[PDB]
């Protein structure tokens, strides 16, 4: 806790505003208040006279829609000196330094004699407010010129909290009174005096616009405008009582900003509605109560950390929208009522003001998730969560924050279509003042109902919405809008539910003799798409059935049909970004491949079923030693193979899956390593012998393994299942492990580092391999999208020629971090969302100084405890102490199975590791500069090849895409198994052998999967090389040089660049075609 507290202090002083600017601004607006007092008074005038007064003036009255017409504006207008006040965070001295800048809220109270008791009806008060503001801007402008301040002051109108009914004047300073360096903007808010209108008449249930429907939005704007100083007095008292109020407030402000929350209006579409004020008011309401028993949830003696935690805990658990609402008295203990108004409500009995009227239901649900999510990180003790909670912005990219994004292009967008605009109608104008408010809800309700359980949270964003307009204009002017609609296009952002996002059928109300209300709306909503169907269990329900595709999810089809039917038949819905990612995943050559969802693992299970058939055969055989267990450790057994298994597709590199066969413990095992390996082969011979005789339908052949260095006697039995699958069997013996340790002990001191590397590979294949496949398989079922994203990530690596050096297991462990450690984001729910999160993590991962350690556990045991967590941390510091620059080891990936952390990340050359992060940094930079679009994705998946010193082009004799099981194909194995090599790609083996010979001089890379990244025919592969800087220049001739070089002098030799190509060329034989240097 002490570490957290000191972190809090460091954060607070970092964001603390510099006191010099406070005097600088305080010098200015103090002089500003003199100018306002200079403004003269004014006489009664009707709309006709004020229009003539402002007819020629540069200023224009910002009348609120509907603009006052002569017939209904019989009431007159007047102006008098305001009762000036300062409010906001600045008044409470709770502001922080913001690079984008802050705002100083100056309130001008309209004198009460200017109003009538019934001026809160039919926008009477608002229209009086508009002229009162316009008159101020007129006289303020000339006085600003008089004092010569106009040179560096820019004036413009804007909406308070993006509220269309409350235009305000914004004063900003461009580059003695110049406060540009302060980064502040003075806002002039024209409020009403307290208690001018009977607040009971202004309750959310009541109405104030005659047309009866309630007007929560209009009632709030007038009522909140009349209650500004009262809340300042409320907050001032609480600040004195508890000494840590301001520190807690800034913590909430910082937390809200990172999640992209603001006090601005949410009915228009933008995410917000809790700002610092709502966080501050809610904390005050909790300090004087909050419990159902009206007991205090926060104590004035609480510290900053405690105060922040309570409000976060309050939001996370107790519901303020559907079931329950919180009432308090600003001017009386705050009590939580169980009843709910079906909208976010934080009622104030003293003021009769609901502080969360600006909030939409959809945005409220997202915060409750965010508040709940942080409450979990806040309770976390093993890992520090300060940076994730406060020092990480998740709103920078909508794709990373939202699983799916659909942009809907509305028709006729210099006004919305007559049919579309006609839907707005007079009735919804009363409920929803602006069309943008109306349309945002219309999209949300139909989209929410249509998708139903398929989604968790939905956000509707009106892209390109402005809130400030020049003084010469009355309303915001959008280029597409034409003063009609303040938006270019609307975007639908979704948080899908992986469990049910891909259900083929949308279940509905059950059948009944009389159609129920729920059944009626279901049939009306879906129209022809609705149908009544029966199932195996015998239930008769109204349901509609869709069709799965391998290019797009079901949700894309539903929203398109749902929005078009109800919103507008001309709407254009398009999410191409998800479509491109889906296509980049290889398409298997199975029946009905195109119609399979990307979440379907039926191909993998078919491989397992074939393995089970072989699994039974092996045990029932009789051998000298009984079979202890058969453990499959192949890629396809953990749903990670890049291309799904396809029967008889033996050209795929991942065709032959490794299986660990273990016998009973015996004391007769050979004590010599080569004898032990040949003892294992002898058992495999008998397994092949009995398998060949008893089950002739299985075919088998023997292949050698050299992955473990210096153990050249390993022989693995390859079994070709009749179903069309291949399995590779290797024998594990208990004596095998201790024999390697014996080698290390007996090895000379200088060779011991070499031998342990050999042991490191053996454990990665035999011992650690079993654990990794076990944990990853079980976890993958909870993380549905893990299998596609990791496959696509491996596809991304291969295009850039990195899989040749990055072992597979390292690739999964990096790709699973967004799932096991989703903070500060959510668990990925889409292929697009998941893949980009992996790139984001690598981009910001400083592997030199920060280790990566994972809790491979299902969503909230085997979670790392504090002792284990510190133990792995101590391992990293020991390694970095010996390897500070990180030359020997780059990526430290550890978990319960691998506490050492060097098991799956050893042997990677430094240029490759930097290249991986270098590509990630460019990818994120590319996305920031250019938004996610078709061109950007193609650039992501296209490899440069220009950085490499020399590039070698290879072509296979025959296209391998068909035999790899990739649908742009063999149906039986060759009669002579020697013919298998004829349909294999050997360039991967060439690179491996070339790397060993030229380890000291060259680093060669190639595309492991040629069928996917080898063109249309899958026959083109490329070998790229890198000359180390040392041997790039000339060197003195020495015996220990260890490189192919050409002399220039008696003792000067240079890298024999041309000869190495002759070496590389002749391996290819017919394969190599062209060279680039």
């Amino acid at each position: 806790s002490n570490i957290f507290k000191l972190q809090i202090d460091e954060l607070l002083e970092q964001v603390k505003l510099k006191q010099k600017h406070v005097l600088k601004v305080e010098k200015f607006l103090h002089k500003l208040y003199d100018i306002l007092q200079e403004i003269p008074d004014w006489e009664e005038k009707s709309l006709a006279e004020v229009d003539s007064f402002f007819k020629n003036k540069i200023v224009s009255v910002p009348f609120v829609d509907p603009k006052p017409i002569p017939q209904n504006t019989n009431y007159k207008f007047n102006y008098k000196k305001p009762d000036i006040s300062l409010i906001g965070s600045f008044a409470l001295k709770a502001g922080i330094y913001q690079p984008n800048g802050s705002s100083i809220d100056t309130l001008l109270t309209m004198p009460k004699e200017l109003f009538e008791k019934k001026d809160f009806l039919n926008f009477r008060c608002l229209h009086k407010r508009s002229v009162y503001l316009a008159y101020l801007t007129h006289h303020l402008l000339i006085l600003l010129k008089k004092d010569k301040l106009d040179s560096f002051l820019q004036l413009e109108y804007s909406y308070f909290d993006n509220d269309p009914l409350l235009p305000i004047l914004r004063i900003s300073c461009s580059k003695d009174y110049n406060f540009y360096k302060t980064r502040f903007s003075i806002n002039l808010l024209i409020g009403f005096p307290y208690k001018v209108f009977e607040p009971k008449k202004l309750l959310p249930n009541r109405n104030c616009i005659r047309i009866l429907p309630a007007t929560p939005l209009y009632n709030f704007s007038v009522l909140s405008s009349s209650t500004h100083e009262n809340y300042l007095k409320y907050l001032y008292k609480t600040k004195k009582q508890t000494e840590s109020f301001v520190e807690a407030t800034v913590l909430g402000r910082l937390w809200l900003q990172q999640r992209g929350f603001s006090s601005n209006m949410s009915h228009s579409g933008s995410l917000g509605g809790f700002g610092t004020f709502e966080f501050t008011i809610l904390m005050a309401a909790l300090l004087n109560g909050g419990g159902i028993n009206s007991n205090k949830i926060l104590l004035h003696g609480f510290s900053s950390y405690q105060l922040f935690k309570g409000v976060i805990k309050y939001l996370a658990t107790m519901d303020l929208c559907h079931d329950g609402h919180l009432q308090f008295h600003s001017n009386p203990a705050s009590k939580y009522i169980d009843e709910g108004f079906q909208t976010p409500t934080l009622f104030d009995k003293s003021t009769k003001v609901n502080i969360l009227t600006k909030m939409t239901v959809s945005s409220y649900q997202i915060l409750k998730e965010y508040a709940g999510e942080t409450l979990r990180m806040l309770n976390n003790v093993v890992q520090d969560q300060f940076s994730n909670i406060f020092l990480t912005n998740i709103s920078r990219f909508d794709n990373l924050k939202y699983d799916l994004c659909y942009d809907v292009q509305l028709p006729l967008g210099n006004n919305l279509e007559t049919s579309l605009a006609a839907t707005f109608g007079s009735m919804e104008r009363v409920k929803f003042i602006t069309l943008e408010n109306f349309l945002a809800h219309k999209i949300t309700n139909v989209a929410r109902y249509a998708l139903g359980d398929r989604i968790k949270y939905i956000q509707i964003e009106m892209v390109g919405q402005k809130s400030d307009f020049p003084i010469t204009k009355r309303k915001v002017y959008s280029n597409t809008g034409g003063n009609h609609f303040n938006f270019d296009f609307v975007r639908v952002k979704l948080i899908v539910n992986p469990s049910e996002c891909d259900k083929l059928v949308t279940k509905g109300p059950a059948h009944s003799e009389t159609m129920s209300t729920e059944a009626a709306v279901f049939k009306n909503f879906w129209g022809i798409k609705s149908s009544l169907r029966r199932f195996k269990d015998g239930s008769i329900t109204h349901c509609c059935v869709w069709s799965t595709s391998s290019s797009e999810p079901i949700i894309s089809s539903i929203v398109n049909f749902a929005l078009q039917k109800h919103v507008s038949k001309k709407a254009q819905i398009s999410n191409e970004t998800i479509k491109k990612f889906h296509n980049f995943l290889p398409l298997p050559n199975l029946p009905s491949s195109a119609k399979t969802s990307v979440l379907n693992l039926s191909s993998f299970f078919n491989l397992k079923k074939s393995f089970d058939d072989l699994y039974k055969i092996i045990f029932q055989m009789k051998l000298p030693l009984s079979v202890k267990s058969i453990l499959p450790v192949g890629s396809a057994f953990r749903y990670t193979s890049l291309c799904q298994p396809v029967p008889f597709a033996y050209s795929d590199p991942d065709f032959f899956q490794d299986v660990i066969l273990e016998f009973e413990t015996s004391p007769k095992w050979p004590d010599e390593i080569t004898s032990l390996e040949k003892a294992k082969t002898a058992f495999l011979l008998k397994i092949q012998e009995e398998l060949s005789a008893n089950s002739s339908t299985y075919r088998s052949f023997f292949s050698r393994d050299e992955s473990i260095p210096y153990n050249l006697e390993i022989v693995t039995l390859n079994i070709l299942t009749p179903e069309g699958y291949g399995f590779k069997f290797r024998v594990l013996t208990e004596r095998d492990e201790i024999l390697y340790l014996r080698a290390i002990a007996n090895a000379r001191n200088e060779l011991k580092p070499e031998l342990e590397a050999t042991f490191l590979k053996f454990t990665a294949k035999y011992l650690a391999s079993v654990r990794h496949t076990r944990t990853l398989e079980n976890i993958s079922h909870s993380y549905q999208f893990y299998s596609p994203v990791v496959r696509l990530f491996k596809r991304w690596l291969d295009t850039h020629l990195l899989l040749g050096h990055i072992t597979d297991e390292l690739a999964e462990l990096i790709a699973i971090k967004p799932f096991v450690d989703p903070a500060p984001y959510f668990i990925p729910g889409s292929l697009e969302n998941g893949f980009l999160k992996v790139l984001k993590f690598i981009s910001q991962w400083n592997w030199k100084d920060d280790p990566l350690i994972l809790d491979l556990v299902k969503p909230e045991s085997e979670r790392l405890t504090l002792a284990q967590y510190k133990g792995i941390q101590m391992n990293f510091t020991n390694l970095r102490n010996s390897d500070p620059n990180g030359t020997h080891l780059q990526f430290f990936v550890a978990s319960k199975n691998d506490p050492s952390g060097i098991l799956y990340s050893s042997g990677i050359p430094l240029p490759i590791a930097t290249r991986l992060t270098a590509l990630a940094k460019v990818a994120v930079n590319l996305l920031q500069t250019h938004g996610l679009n078709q061109q950007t994705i193609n650039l992501l998946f296209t490899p440069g090849l220009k950085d490499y010193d020399f590039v070698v082009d290879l072509r296979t004799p025959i296209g391998l895409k068909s035999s790899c099981g990739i649908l742009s194909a063999p149906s039986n194995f060759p009669e002579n198994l020697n013919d298998l090599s004829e349909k294999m790609d050997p360039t991967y083996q060439l690179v491996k052998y070339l790397n060993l010979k030229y380890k000291n001089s060259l680093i060669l890379s190639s595309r492991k999967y040629i069928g996917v990244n080898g063109g249309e025919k899958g026959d083109k592969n490329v070998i790229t090389g890198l000359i180390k800087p040392l041997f790039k220049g000339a060197h003195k001739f020495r015996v220990n040089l260890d490189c192919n070089v050409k002399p220039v002098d008696d003792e000067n030799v240079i890298l024999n660049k041309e000869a190495i190509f002759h070496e590389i060329a002749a391996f290819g034989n017919d394969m190599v075609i062209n060279f680039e240097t």
Binding site: H800, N846, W847, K848, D849, N885, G886, L910, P911, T914, R915, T917, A918, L919, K921, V922, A923, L926, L939, L940, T942, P943, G944, L945, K946, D947, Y948, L1026, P1029
Partner: peptide, 13 residues
């Protein structure tokens, strides 16, 4: 295309 100069000093970090 997605091109990044090759770094051998880990300077990108």
């Amino acid at each position: 295309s997605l091109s990044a100069g090759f770094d051998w000093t880990a300077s990108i970090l």
